[PDB]
Amino acid sequence: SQRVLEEWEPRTKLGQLVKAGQITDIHEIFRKGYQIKEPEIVDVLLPEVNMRENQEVLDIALTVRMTDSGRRIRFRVLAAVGNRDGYVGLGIGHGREVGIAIRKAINYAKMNIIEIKRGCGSWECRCRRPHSIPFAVEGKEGSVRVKLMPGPRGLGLVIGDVGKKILSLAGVQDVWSQSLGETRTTVNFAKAVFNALYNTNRVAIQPGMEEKYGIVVGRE
Amino acid sequence: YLVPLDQYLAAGVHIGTQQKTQDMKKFIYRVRQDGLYVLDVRKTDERLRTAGKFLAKFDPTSILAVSVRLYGQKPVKKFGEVTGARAIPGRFLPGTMTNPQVKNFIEPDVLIVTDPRADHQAMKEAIEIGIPIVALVDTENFLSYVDLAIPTNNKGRKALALIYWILAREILYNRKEIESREDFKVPVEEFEMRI
Amino acid sequence: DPKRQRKKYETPSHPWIKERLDRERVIMRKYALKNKKELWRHETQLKEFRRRARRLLAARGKQAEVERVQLLQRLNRLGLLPADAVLDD
Amino acid sequence: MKRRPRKWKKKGRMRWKWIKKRIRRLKKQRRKERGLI
Amino acid sequence: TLLDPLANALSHITNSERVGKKEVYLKPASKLMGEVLRVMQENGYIGEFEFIDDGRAGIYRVQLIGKINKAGAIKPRFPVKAREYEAWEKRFLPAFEFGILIVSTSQGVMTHKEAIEKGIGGRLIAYVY
Amino acid sequence: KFEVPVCTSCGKEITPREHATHFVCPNCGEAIIWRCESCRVLSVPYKCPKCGWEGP
Amino acid sequence: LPKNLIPMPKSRFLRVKCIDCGNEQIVFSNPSTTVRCLVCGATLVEPTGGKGILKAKVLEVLE
Amino acid sequence: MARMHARKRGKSGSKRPPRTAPPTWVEYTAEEVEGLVVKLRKEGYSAAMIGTILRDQYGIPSVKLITGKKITKILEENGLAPQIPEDLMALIRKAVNLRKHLEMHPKDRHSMRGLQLTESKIRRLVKYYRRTGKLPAKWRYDPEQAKLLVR
RNA sequence: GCCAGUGGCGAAGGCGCCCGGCUGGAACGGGUCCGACGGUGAGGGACGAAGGCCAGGGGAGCGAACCGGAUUAGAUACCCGGGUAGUCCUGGCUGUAAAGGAUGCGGGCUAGGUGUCGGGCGAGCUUCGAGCUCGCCCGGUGCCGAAGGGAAGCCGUUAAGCCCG
RNA sequence: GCCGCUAUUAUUGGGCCUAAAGCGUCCGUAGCCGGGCCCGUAAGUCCCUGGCGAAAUCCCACGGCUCAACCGUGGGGCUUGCU
Ligand SMILES: [Mg+2]
Ligand SMILES: [Mg+2]
Ligand SMILES: [Mg+2]
Ligand SMILES: [Mg+2]
Ligand SMILES: [Mg+2]
Ligand SMILES: [Zn+2]
Ligand SMILES: [Zn+2]
Ligand SMILES: [Zn+2]
């Protein structure tokens, strides 16, 4: 986006390329080992992430440190951002104030952006269009064990509110879940969902399965 | 067949260590009755040729060579002054590759660590970037996160000077910054510490 | 152990979801409905259509083909789908 | 006895050896007043 | 003790695929291990397998190609009529025609797909996806 | 669309934020060796498809 | 492929001749019994925990 | 193979190489090999000892490879195979000697356990050999009858 | 006793002066024999530290109970001096323990490094020693450790990993 | 009060070092699990077919009470199955 691009000086090799007009697509950003240390990169190549909608704050916790002279409180903020196609990121941010924590969490989210596979793999849609995920997938963080299953079109997101938010930002409209562990731990629940969505890429396939499951790696 | 054989063996390149590694027994030629393993100079020579081609295809300033070890601190410095190859002899200064808020922030395209166990810092920062790692490895080195390996004593003043001298020569040869290799002028004694 | 006539509408799993409430409030004002009961009745109609369609996707012939045809011609007759329609629709 | 390491802990408890000994004294009294007196 | 060379073979393949090995060796070979590998080759999960012969039960050398996520034995070798594969798929596989359930039938060892197109059931013995 | 790269060792379709690496074949050029994180950290040898230079 | 595939013997059968009669005789390198010449009764290999210690093989072969 | 009462994963043993045909360096034919087997059984050697001697002295690997038959098959053909099988016999002799020791040494409970395990093995093999016919069905281990048996 | 050890043997409990006798089990080596004889085991049985009990002996030291001296506000204790049972032997009963690797047993797979015990192999050295050093194989016993696992601590080819029971 | 929530009964699908939880250890009976090849049988298993598993109830379409509920026509399913 031109707006941030003007104000932005890159500071990184990747940012130099982006500014220079090279690496014009976030797909060219990803699967190369590259190091993203710049939400400005992500905003340039994915401007819909700059939007208050398409941003989601998922948890705010007041955490305590003890000292002589009493309690010193910090704010942990779990935020997610995403383009409602196939890109989503998740970040934690800490601050002495909630607003600092929020902007930091969103920056780290844009840095932790990932690219996911979308499709249709349920026995009872077979629509070959990317409303769900193409195959069941699993993820974990802490005690939380999230198992996402493809669902039919119009089902909705059969998952807790955190997963609803993250999957909406990632463009998944329909899904079934089975969960284990402590889902009342929002951080680890969210990371488990996130890691499942990345395991969509970790899973292997055969040639024709792309066509039959409607597999889509980013935008459609 | 460069640098015939006795210059290698005088530098002590074939000399390994009492410890071994299965990642490196491919290169280990034998073990002698004292418990010390010996590397194959033929493989050393081959891998040096390939490293030369590789780093020649790379851009000069994008090359970074690090050496915590002092015996390599000097010849890495000379390698840099010869090739344009971002020498880091001292301590790596954690954040050189990852924190853009350091003074000397470097985002290279390849890395020439002299010993991975001593340069574990640079290794993991390069890992995070996703750049290749060329490494000098002795019989006790693991090949984790090493995309090109060169067998070497990697603890000797000599043999470090010689390996870096050979690399510089082969890089310039493959860049055509020199014609036939004998047109190289620099001495190994210049690459060496000489205490 | 007999029949026991059952409701033909389903109530929501949670009564106080802000999203569902807003959505349903809008629908009820737009279509001038007396009852959430009435809305949920039509939602349940839809749900049953969808479940049949699902089953018949994941079904095999000589029956479940009859029911495919029956579903589609019923929905055509009701005016929810065109005649060239499918379970995807 | 069947015992419980949980009981062996002391966070809000009396020592289990001595709880045990008390239990056994009680049991002895009961056995004593049951069968012969 | 040793029980089900087939399960051991499949678990070995699974673990070797996780660590990126190119070839595995399956030591207490069997005609069943061979049929299962025939099927896995035909459906494109492994590459090339050859029977090495010792004086013992024989070995299989199996060249992999990086197309296995989970391969395993359905060890209660479950009887399955020709119209229950939907359910067993939903239990063992992630999407509707993703992997392969291997079925022993009276007409040989087959995939559930071939079993369906033949209208014959049998006993489930393995899954691969 | 765009293509997804694939390791020369594992053949397992490199992922977005993997600590992977890519570089041309030494002794061949003309070939992009892709190398996944698992393969790098476990010292899984590769081999150029055009040439047969093995490498770590 | 190496050293466990098709586990093969390290022992060898080897042809020896006694010093007294000179009859060539096949034997085993890792014997459990003192091996005696079939003609003279002379010990050709004395048993040990492993590889037997060989007497009387000055002209030797191994298969 | 301390397994079965010690659970050590010992691997000591023989490594027969795969051989579809006999070796060419071998001198003896099936017939004279059989003759040697019979000779040694008359000398009083068990089948295991016979194979050991034919391996060490005569350079015969695998009488089975040579003849196509086993040593106990050869013995039963020439009417020399043991009445009860050798392994069982060996266990019974051990048990009897140990019974004697334990009568003169009642407090050697560790050797008593060794006896228990020995008799357990006996019972196992008896079960198997009854099932396969190498013993009558009515056969049963008993210490005193086994003493008479050995003696 | 010192030697005596992340040492060894043993199912565990546990086992240390030497010599002789009887005896158990394991590892290694093994082109030896048998030919699936295997695993686990409800129930059932055997073994099972200290302590305690029955009977009979013995009784140095230590020593519950007890007896005295102190201490202390008190001191049914800690400290001191004594001291019964007991600790030892014989034969029995008891059948409990932080009986703990707080980790049931078997089998297959998933990087290794470095020690150490035992056997074997190959080299080198030797004062030519049942000697020393190096390497390799098998089996034990430890530390570390990538991947991996896990709530984490930590585990990590002696799994708390994947699979088969 | 029952189901669900509850993968807090776990076949699917739970756990047992430190949180509840590996018998003190071993031995072994029933039971369960069982290496590889060949031949046979065809008991389980699978396919096809005959006879049964009432009606109502369940699903679907179509018709009649204004529609619906209800009722009828027909198709299918259900009965643990047995043969
Ligand atoms: Mg550790
Ligand atoms: Mg409960
Ligand atoms: Mg639980
Ligand atoms: Mg506990
Ligand atoms: Mg009926
Ligand atoms: Zn790979
Ligand atoms: Zn190449
Ligand atoms: Zn002679």
Short mmCIF file of C-alpha atoms and ligand atoms in Angstrom, two decimals, chain F residues 24-33 47-53, ligand 7:
data_model
loop_
_atom_site.label_atom_id
_atom_site.label_comp_id
_atom_site.label_asym_id
_atom_site.label_seq_id
_atom_site.Cartn_x
_atom_site.Cartn_y
_atom_site.Cartn_z
CA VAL F 24 22.10 -23.96 -6.61
CA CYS F 25 23.96 -27.20 -7.04
CA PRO F 26 27.69 -26.84 -6.62
CA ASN F 27 29.58 -28.77 -9.29
CA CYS F 28 26.52 -28.53 -11.52
CA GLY F 29 24.78 -25.25 -11.18
CA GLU F 30 21.58 -25.36 -13.21
CA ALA F 31 19.62 -26.95 -10.34
CA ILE F 32 18.01 -25.52 -7.23
CA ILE F 33 18.61 -27.74 -4.23
CA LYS F 47 21.75 -35.46 -4.23
CA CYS F 48 21.42 -33.21 -7.26
CA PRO F 49 18.82 -34.46 -9.74
CA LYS F 50 20.78 -33.34 -12.80
CA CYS F 51 24.24 -34.35 -11.62
CA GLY F 52 24.76 -36.86 -8.83
CA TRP F 53 26.74 -34.72 -6.41
ZN ZN K 7 23.76 -30.22 -10.14
#
